[PDB]
Every structure is written in C-alpha cells, then in structure tokens.
C-alpha cells in the first residue's frame, strides 16, 4: 500500500475547469517533500506551600504555513502547437515572474518565440504573487495545497551531475481530497513529448563563464570548478491570534526577492586569467565596482545545441578568497544590483535546445537572441 | 588493573544494616556512566599604561550535582517468598513512585499481587523524594553517591532490539570508600533466580497499540513502527555561595515531573486505519481533545505470556506529521493530562510474565488486571 | 571409532512420546554439516611510559545460533495407510509451510490426496515458525538441536545429476545426550518402503519449461540448459548482552521469506523461440511486466510418470543476459510477486509419481491437478 | 544453429552509406565478449504488529552502458592504393587518437607515409571522442552497438606468445537488427590481402629494450623477461533518474586518459647492467627523475624487418622491486609524464613491416623514421 | 649468473669486528624472501571548460619498512666449548627474548645448561628490542638490512613433515654493499658440527599433548592430528612526512607481543578422552577457565632422545568446534594469559637432544628440567 514515487504532481491556476492550459503535470525527483506543522504552548504553575502540585495543560495555538519543495531538470523543447520553445514547468516560472495573468508573448516576465524561452523580472514587485495550486496524487488518494506561493529557487552548476533546479515554497494549508478531482492521464505528458525530451538534456560539464569590467572595459577568461546561484523571495505569513479556538494563516507579504551567486575556480597564471582578476580586485578596494557576468549552462557552439544562459548586467563582485584545497582553490561571490532603486534587475534568463554563439551574443546584449540586437 | 565491567551496582535505602530487604543488586548494561564536576571562575585585570601586565588567578567556586545514569532490561519474575510478581529493580521504581516508605501491598505508588506488578503516581507530589544511595564496586575498590535522587526514565519501543529502560539521576556528592562496606555476594542475585530470569525477556516486536476516542467513542487499529516515551522530574539543586571557601549543594527541589510519548507508523488505507485517524485529527482542529492510549510491550495472547503495559486514560494528541521516508512515515506526539489540576495522572504501569488479554482488559479498566473490574 | 555416515537423522515435533506420527527419519547425503560457534572479545591496554606492559584478557561473550544443513532427493510415494501420495520429509515441508499444527487434508500449507502432494504458502506469515527438533545419532552417541527452525531451501535443476534439494537452518543450541532417547529402528524406514522408493526417482534431464505472457497472452517454447531456484526466510536471532556471565540466544524473528529463480538456455532462432522472447524483452523496457512460469522436473507424459512441478502465477522477468559460452548461452532471472501486498504468493508446489499432462494442466490452473479445475 | 565464431565484426563511422572507406572488417580472436546490464532495486516493508506481512516489489531502474571487448594481432602491411603502410584496424586507432575527422596525412593522431605508420596523442583532449559504431554478425542475424567509444587498450610483450592487443570499450545500447544492413563480403578483407598478411606477423621474442637517463646522460643494456603496457581513458556515462519509467544513458564524459607500463628482467651483473641501474635508482631517492624508454616489439635489424616501436620521451621510473623467483627476478614500473600540464604526452607509436635500425633512430628522435631527423 | 640458493645468510649484533661470537651463519630453506617497497601518490586536475586537459604528476612519498622472512629447522646440539646444549640460531632467539645484552647463563630470556636450552619472556616488555643486522650473500655480491627487528615466529606441528619454524621481521632499509665485509667461510659452520647435526633432527610424528584442568584438577589423554602455534610482536614503524624530499622510517614501536595456539584431533570415546573434554567445555560456559598445556615435539622417552617442549601454565581454552571431515575432526584454540597484568607469560620453551620423561616433568614444573624441582 502507498508506494513512494507512485505520487504524481500537478499545478493549476484554478481549482475547477482543469485542462492542458490551466493545469500541468511536472516531472519530479526522488527527494520531494511536503508537510504542515502546528504551534504548541505549555503552561504550568509553581507554588510555595506544603502540598506541591503539578497540573499543566498545553493548548494548540495555530498552524504554520505548510511547506513544500522538490527538484526537476531543466528541459526545453519545441511545442508543435505554436512552434516555439517551452519548458514543461513554465507555469511556475510565470508564477515567479509576476503576479498577473499569463502572456507568453507580451515579453513581460516569462515569454518565448520560435527560437528560445526567456524570463525577466520587470513586473514582479507586488505585495502578493500569482496564486497557484499544487495537487499531489498517490494510489487511490489525493491531496492539495491551498494558495501555494513560490519562495526560493536554486541552481547548482555542478561539474559532473546533470543540471537541475530546486524549488521551495509555502501555502496556507494542506488538505486531503475525498475523490478524484480531474483526469490523471488526459492532462499529463504524452509519449512523443518524452521522446522529444530525451534529447533535451543539458550536458552540464560544458558550462562556460564570461566576465567583463564596466570600469576599464577589461575582460577575463576564467575556467571554473562549479558553483551555485539562488533566487529568493522572503515570503512572510500573517496570522491573528485567537488562541481560544486555534488560528490559521490568512495572507502573505512578499518581502524583498533576491538574486545571488557564487563561483569557484583554480588560480590560473595566464593573460587575463584568474590571477590577473585576483590582483585587480585586491588592488582596487573600491566601495562599488560594476561587472557583467554570463553563465552558459551546457556551453555554446557555432551549431545549434541545447543550453541555458544566466545574465547579470550590473553584478557587483565581492573580494575573492583562497582556500587550502589540493590545488589553490579560489572562490568569488556576487549579487544582483539594479541601476538605481526602482528599475529592473538583471532579469535575463534564457533557455533553449538550439542556442548558437551568435544568438548568445544577442541574448546577452538584449535579453533576446532571436531578433537583431542594436 | 581495574577491568571495566567488573563494576557491580547496589542500591540501598540506608547506609548501614545492609541485607536483602534494604539493599538490592541490579543488572547493568555496558554504557553505565557517572561523574562529578566543579565550577571555575577566571578574573583578570586590564590597565592603560606603559608597562602592561597579566596577573590572573582562577579560584574553585563550587561543585555541581553529581550525575549518574545507566540502563537495564525489563524483567518480571515471581518471588518464591511471597508468590507475587516482582522486578529486581523495584526499589528504584518505588523511589520514583513516592517519597515515603515502601509498601508493596498498599496499592500506592508501586505494588503487586499474585498475578502482576503495578506502578502508579498517586502520592508522588512532594518537594523532595525518597532518598536512596548508590554503591559502585570495582576490583578492590568501592565508591558511592551520597543522597542520590532519580530524575529521568526513558523507554524506547524498538522494532528489533529487546525492550530496555534508561535511567538518569543526580546526587549531592561522589565519594570513594576506604574498605568493603557490606557483603558483595551474599546480598546479590543467585543462580536459580537467573535461571527463572532467562525466560522472562520481552519479545519486543510483538508490542501492540490501541487507541480510543473520548468524544465520539471511536476506535482505530494502528500498526506501529516503534516509538518512545519518557518520564521526567525536573530536579533542581540549591547551593549557597561562600566562594571564599568553596561550596557544596545542600538540597534539592522536585519540580514538575512529566510523562510524554511519541509514536511512528505507516499511513495505512483501511477502515478505522491511520488514514482515518489522520483525517479526523486534521479536520478536528479542536483546542483540547481527549484520548485513551494503550501500549502492550511484548504483545498479548489469550494464554499466559510475558508483557508490559502502559496506560494513558486522558492523553491529548497533537497534530500528526508526515515524513519523506521510503514509505510515507507518519509521526504522532502525546502528553499525559490529569483530570483537573490536582488529581492523579495516567499512572497505570503494569508488568508481568503471564498477562492474558482478559487480564489486560481489567488492567486497562482499573490499573489492576487481577481482581474483578467494575 | 565413530565412522562417518553411521550417523542417522530424525526430526520430531516434540521431545517426548516418539512414534511414527510425531517423529520421522530422513535419508541424508554425504555432505551433511552442523556446528555451533561462540563470540570472543580481546581487550588490551596501551600506555606511554618507561616500563611498557602487555596484559590482555579475552572473555567469552555469547553463543551464535547453531547452524545445520544437509541435502536429500525428491521422493514421492504412496502411503498404504491412507492411499495418498507423500514424501518421507513432509514434516519439514509442513514446518516451512506454516507455524501451526499439521493437517495434510486442510489444503493449507502442505496437503495431499489420492493423486499427488501439494505445498502452498497461504498461512505462513508469522513472527515465528513451527518449532521442530533434530536428532543426530552416531555409534553409541546421541546429540540434538534445541528449537531448530528452517531457513533456506534450494533446488538445482541440473542437466545430468539427479534432482535434489538442499536445506539449511539454525537452532538455539547443540546439546549432546547421555543415553538413547527413542528406538532407532522401530521409528525408521522399512525395507518394503525402500523397495517402493527405488522406482520413485526423478529422471532429471526430462525437465521442461513453459512460459506465458500476461499482457499479450503470448507463449514461447524454450529448451533449457539447467538452472536453480531458492526459497529463503531471512531468520534472525535475538540475544541480550550480559557478558559478565555469557549469553545465549532467546528467540528468533522471521523476516521476509523469499522465492527466486534463474534459468539458462541457448539463443534459438525459431517461432516463439528464445530469440523472439529476447527481442520482446529488450524492446519492452516496461517497469513491471507479468508472466506465468512452469517448471516440470522429470518432464511430463500422457501416461503416469514421476514428476514435480513449480508454478509461478505472477513472476516478473528481469532483462536477460548473453554470455560468451561456446554456443551463445543466455540467462534469465525471475522473482515471485504476489498480487498486492498481503495476498498469497506463487505457492503452488506439486509432487507425485504419476502425473499426466492433463493432470498437469489442472495443477497449473488451480494448484491441484486431481479435481476438476474451473 | 548459431555456431560461435561464425560471428564477424565490422566498424563504421556512420550508419548509412557503407563502403571500404567508412566501414572496415577486423579480425577477431576467440574470447570476444559483449553484453548489456540493468539495475534493480528491492523495496520491502517491516511492521511491528500481530499479523506480519511480506509484500515486496522490485522495479527496473535503468540500463548500464553496454560493454564490449576483444583482441587482435598487430598487423602492418602496404596498401596498394597509396603505397603506404597501414593496419586493418586503423579506424579504431584514429578513434582513440582524436575526436575529429580522419586524415592519415595531417600527422595529427594517426598518420602514415611510404615507410611506416605512426600514432600520436596531440589532439585528443576532448570532453568526447570520435563516435563509432560496431556491427556484429551471426548466421542469419545482426546486432550492433549504438554510439560505442573506446576506453582501454593493453599490450602484453610476452616471451613466447605472438604480440597482440586487447581492446575494451562501452556504448549506449545493444540493439539487434531485423535484416542485413550492408554487404557482408564486398566490404570485407580479400584473399590477396591475407596472402600479404601471412608475412606480417611479429616475431615476439626478438623484442628489445633501451633506456637513457635524462640527468647524467647515462644508458644501460637491459635484457628483459616480458612485460605489459596499457592506455586507458577513464570514460564515464551520465544518466538522469526518472525511475517511474526506466532510464537510459544519454552521454559520456572523457576523463583523464592514461599511459602506464611495467617491465621484468633478471638482476644481471654487467657494465651498465641491471645491477648498476638498480644501485643508481636505490641511491638516487630523488622525487622526480626523468628517463627515455624505447620498446622495439619484434626487435630491430640493419635489414628491413617487421617491427613495432613504443617511445617514452619523459617517463618517470618508480623504485624497482626484487622477487623470490627461481633466478632473482626484478620488476620496474613506469608512467608517461608530459612536459608541463597541457603539452603533448609521449605519443609516439610506430608500426611497420620494414623498420631498420637507422630508421628506428629517426623514429625515436622525432616520432617519424622516414624523413631526415634534426 | 646469480644462482638462487648460492645465497648465504649471516646475523650480527654489530656491523664491525665480526667473529664467531657476535656473528653467526644460519641454515635457510628454499622460500627465503626479502624486499623493500615505496609509497606513491597521484594528483590530477579536473576542469569544467571548453578545452579539457590532463596533466598529472605522481611523486615518490616515502619508503615502507623493508620486509624479510625465512624458515629453518629446530636443531639442538652440544657445544664442545661449554659442554651445553645450544642451537645455531640462538642469537635470534635472544633477540626475540629481550632487548638487552646476551647472557646464556643469567636464566633471563634465553639460557642453557649442560642438559638443555631454555627460552623465557621475563624481561622483554620494552618500547624497542635488541637491534640486529642481517647480511645476505650471493655470488660476488653482498647486501644487508639496516636495523632489522624480529616480529613474528610460527611453528607448525605437522603429522608428516619435519618440525620447522618460520620467522618474519622488518628493518629500516635494504642496502647493497660494494665489497666483501667479513670472511664468508671462517665464521660459518664447520663439517664436524653438521656431522653432529645429522642426528639432531626431530621425528615430528611422535609429538604428544598433555592437558590439565586448574579448577577440578582433571586431566585428559588427547591424541592429536597436528596444529600450530604462533608468537607475534605487532611491531610498528614511525615516519615523518616531508614529502617534498622523500621520507625514511626513523624508528619502531614494539606493540603487544602475543602467543596463541590451535590444535586438532578426532572425537574419541574413552575415559578422560576428547569426548569427555568436549562435554565438560560445553557444559561449563564459564567466562574464564584455566588450563595447563604441554606440547612435546618429538615425543618423550625414558631414554635420552631429541625433543622440544612448549609449556602453557595458564592458557584459557576457547569453545571447541566440530568439522565435517571424513572422521569427526575437532578443533581447539587457546591463548596465553599471564597471572594479572604485569607478570610473566607462559614463557617456558625447551629444546634438547636428550630429554627424558623425568626431565620433562621438571621442565614442566619449573621451566628447567635439569636441577631438582620443588
């Protein structure tokens, strides 16, 4: 009874009218997790007398926001309906992108064209976010998260493992369901889709890094040894306290979302190498420098190959550190910084199965490698 | 010199007149531990001048309460003298039971009859407790703990390991002894006793759980995957501070003693199963529910078999949690709650080598399975 | 003194009242083995000083479960008392079948009728098993195993050697006996029985295999080159650790028993041949397929002939492998899988001296080839 | 049906357009091997209750990389088309040489001229390698390995046996074929070729060794007793884990390829003999020495004779060992070391049917014995 | 060149002033072995980039302790100079006996008198041992081990083969020598010595065993089927790690030396036979029993005959085991145990060419069979 991965996961914008447009099934890894916790309070009495007592009574106070998390592979493929690049989980990317309706052609948040899929953060600064719903399925059992919201996404550029993304978020409540709400197989993925998928994996070790200085126009060639980057949202949940009858969270505040990254490499002695960058950074000692950072997951080729691209137009670089690893490991940490307070952040995320270096240049320049850049 | 387990342990009510009635030897496991610590204080001076100095002098301040702990197996057997069930370590059970004299027939605290041994907490709420003495013996060496008091007892219902109990407590001081105080072998256990013992072990995996709702009279069948329960006392030690000549603890306060427990199981889809209980608990959301909990260590049979029983007449159940184990592990936590402030707690602990299911029903109903229950 | 095979073996349900009903002598092969081992622990001291020392003292800790094993031929014959097929060693088959009393007519576990002998696993899932006793006899000497339990049985379908079974198990202790406990010859086999036996051997090379697909209703004809199958129980022994006076095992846990098998053949190019099965299995790549497997040890005939039958109603087949043997050897591995968690496994084992193909069909269909199948 | 060596082996760069230029048949020895394996996972449940259960279900997880291996003789002969030395299996030598297109005249990787055939490792450091295809043929049956890559090559310089090479590699999958893909005889070898071949065998026992010190310019004469050398690649295969529907390897990483060797001899007392080398090596104790090593398989002559040559320009020699063989056997182990991290390794491998000592000197000096060395 | 056994072996206390008193030649068997090994470490780099590399450089790290071992026959004979029994290899026996100077009359370690040669372990517990030197000689070549120390000695009491001892040890370094250091023939054995030797061999099959119980004063007669015993030292070598210039061992720690033994026999049914001992040992189950064990290699006679004696005054016997050999083989294992931590071990080893049973009794009683025992 109740085998582990017989669970299946669906995400929906609304709780009724499920179809291939408002609902989507997503592939999941092994370590999927979800749960819901409650607060407790112990009260006891202490007395100075001849006949000491105990009596103590704890009471349930309230419910914490239900937690959920999983991981999935990066997976671009062409939709036969529109002839455009798309990923199975693009609903959640839109949810993280903005708190308004889906429009994959309006260029805001998440969008696509015949060549590639792009994600930006132009219209995300809200007090709330696009409210979604997560449905979990087991053998003859259903459950779902009410009013789930995404909080944190992380990507680890490993040297050996396949590229993946890890997602975590919270919701108001976890509730089981009495019956089957919608078709488990009609709205799911299909065999020919997965046949196209089997060629869309990212060959992780080919990932390449590019750096450019915004002060002296200097550039460096930096071989790398893996790293990470992370987008956060700092969600918070509000809760009134009528503890005489238990309380439930009523809403959420979207704090300041964040984008950070970290890189590792060897200290290399070469022209415009890691040694030169390290010396420049040490001698600089400026309060605020500016740099442009490009990560090409899967590498790049003159031909059409699968790849993903992370772009930072204004990232400020911290002072690097040297470790005692076997061969002189070096580490660098960087943050996203928008130009002035209210303007857009780095934003540009790109994914496709057919990037070429020329298209990569356009994608870096404008956030879209398809059309002619200025 | 000084082989490890050549240590032997005795417990006595008084320091003189040792015999089989006021002293008892108990079997011990490998990980027995004991020790005594002291406090220290460092004083130093800092000066703003041309000739900086150091001088610093630490002083011994006081002694902390000596700590001791060990573990032993649950072990019921019939005493040939009285024809009643008894355990070798029933002195310490009485000590935890009440702060007054031993009476195994007064039904208060610890008692027994021809069928089984029972322990209750009717008369334990004191500012102190029954003061005992622990003697430790090594090859040609003796030591003892002055005014030891029990604090914490824990029982782990494991799926595979034999049932055991772990005991920890404190005392005023640890003092070595110059000579042999009392006979090491005359007051110890004997061979025929241990021959009877070898059949008194508890076959742990047979342990069974029963739950009953006090609101809707509902009951559930819950297969389990091990768990724990714990009794605490929250002892505290008082100490005046004449640090010009070192200090020693002078007495103890018995805080609020406690009884808690935790259980684990699989999410099972069956009538009155774990799924039904989980749904009821989630939908309930009441501040204070009430339940009756029965643990039968060793299981039960219509025939006479060795077993132990833990009874909770009023335990309140917390909201259960679901883990990401290989097959949908679920966890439940519960506490003992007395009816109103000053009345007796759950209390009922039962042990014997010959429980039957009919006797188990009476034991659950009244705390004694021998006589006719109402 | 003490010639080797002058040993004789008896098995009994109880230690007293030995007769032809509760005790049975079984034929044994040459390689019979039995023994009992003990654990040891070495303690030593290391010191940093000018006068280094040695002293080290090992102590006996406990006894491991006594091991025993042997082998015997498959041997069906008709009992003149009941007019039903029976095997000399059917006590141990019942012991492996269930942990309750013998009933060769209740159809549970092991049973028989006027035509054949059957064994099933309907009522075997216990924490323990039917506790038996093994007596070994040598010239003027007796010994016995206390509380022996069967663990593992293996059958090797060889191309040339006679069919045989190999049995291994464990017990609490091995104990010699001071005198002759029961008649060595009155309860043993008799000459006329063995005269009937001499015709009951299995002509091993005639063994045949049948396979049926549960998805496409497909069947194949597979000539074979020998193989094996094995039933396991994963017994475990529990032992408290009072090492100051040596310990002895007190009980056993029956783990998950198991049924597995392996087959070998040549890659044959024929309609519904091994090549076709190999291609189907390679192209399938399904997570869980289902198949029905029939082994007929001794082959089958339209006439009455001696044979044994192994039936797997739901066996899942692993991906076969190809070896570099002289002519393209191929290997297949399979496991027993019950329908859902708690239901009965494959179970059906059949033995007789007079199987016919029509009776074989009924035996495959229902587990009993005597009565009319549905 | 299906006789053993009626198998024939072909290697192709592409799956279509088979001819004498993109496909080649190679001679094989007896012990050719190939296979493909799959992973399995067993899940079971353990419960503490009165009605213990079993149910366990294994699931197929994924496929391991298909393994293949064989051996063949070293075989140089002159091609009538180009008038240059060539070996039948030079496709696989090119595959091991580099991951780019064939060019037997560009001097990179594998090349040749009118005198001899050479192999180098100048352009092999890639993340992948030249992807080839292996076709295996049996009587009325075809199979092939998809995306096979070479991993390991070994050569054993035996005293008595003919020189041979052993090759092992892996591929994505093993797939049978429904029909005959290409002509089995038109693209194979021809009779006159084999008539030329019968004179191209290497008389193994004539193999000679030369050693030169790079520190003191010292040289030694070392009679040898056989040995080995090995080239490795440390290939690795990547595999996503969607185990709800089985997985297949998607790509490979080329690790660090390697070249090592080992030699054996007698301890000989002579000027510049093995004794002198042993004494020098023992007294040296330097961290990194440098040596030049030459192996001439088949020996050398002033006349034109068949031979092969292994050259190590920078090999570092480990400390030799002495064995207890009948006459004072001694063993030496050596590794290839490039000058600095990124430069070319030893590389130089030479093969021909007409080496002369003067040509051997040029081959040692430059890696090509045909043109005038500097 | 360099014939195998033309090697000769000498042992010396010091490296200069070689004579018949500080140097001795010993007979050796065929399988003599010696060698010296070194450690290696491989370092490699892995990079995630477009132009992957290899470069790897191993470095020599340090030298392990040189190993050496051989075997020789037990060989007592009378020295004409002192008129006392002596063995050719008594230097190494003294070395194993103690770490101080030789004194064959001080009764400590190794000593002798006019009747026999004795070895004890009274003064051996040191951090080091008597440092010796081993010289190996071949045709026109010399080598030696620097600071060799004995570690392990083994004796196999075989039924058919002549008695022998096997010795193994380690040293700091193995170094060849440029010239002849000392006379190879003047310090060696002489012809008349070997003429006396030819009568000093031990007729192995006559070896006898005696056992006595230290609890009930019981004794048994045990015919035996061979066995072994072993003395160990657990030497360890220390080594600093300056790997930038290679390291060499600088010293050794003598761990806990050890004495163990194992015996085999048939299960014999006789008064005080092996059956009785087996029953007593099985029923005993005591943690620590005590026994006295006597091995007489070569047997004993009322007349003067060559023999050796091993004495264990306090050996503790493990639980014996029964094997499936052709006739009921039984095995027993025993260890040496000193009385309390720091006192002397069994120690008593005796050798002579003229033991008599009466002298054997005295040797067992006191460790010396010559003088009058108490």
Author numbering:
A (entry chain D), B (entry chain D), C (entry chain D), D (entry chain D), E (entry chain D): 3 to 376
Q: Would you copy out the relevant sentences from the publication that reported this structure?
A:
The T5 family of viruses are tailed bacteriophages characterized by a long non-contractile tail. The bacteriophage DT57C is closely related to the paradigmal T5 phage, though it recognizes a different receptor (BtuB) and features highly divergent lateral tail fibers (LTF). We present a composite map determined by electron cryo-microscopy (cryo-EM) at resolutions ranging between 2.9 Å to 4.9 Å of the entire T5-like phage particle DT57C, and atomic models comprising its core structural proteins. Our results provide a complete atomic structure of a T5-like phage, provide insights into the process of DNA ejection as well as a structural basis for the design of engineered phages and future mechanistic studies.
The tail of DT57C is composed of 40 stacked rings of tail tube protein (TTP), with each ring containing three subunits. The tail has helical symmetry and 3-fold rotational symmetry, with a rise 41.8 Å and twist 39.5°. While the local resolution of our reconstruction at the flexible Ig-like domains was too low for de novo model building, a predicted structure fitted the molecular envelope well. The tail shaft structure of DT57C is nearly identical to a previously published T5 tail tube structure. To better address tail flexibility and curvature of the segments, we performed asymmetrical reconstruction without imposition of any symmetry, which clearly revealed the presence of TMP inside the tail. Thus, the overall TMP organization within the tail tube of the phage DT57C can be described as a three-stranded parallel coiled coil, with α-helical secondary structure at least at its N- and C-termini (in accordance with secondary structure prediction).
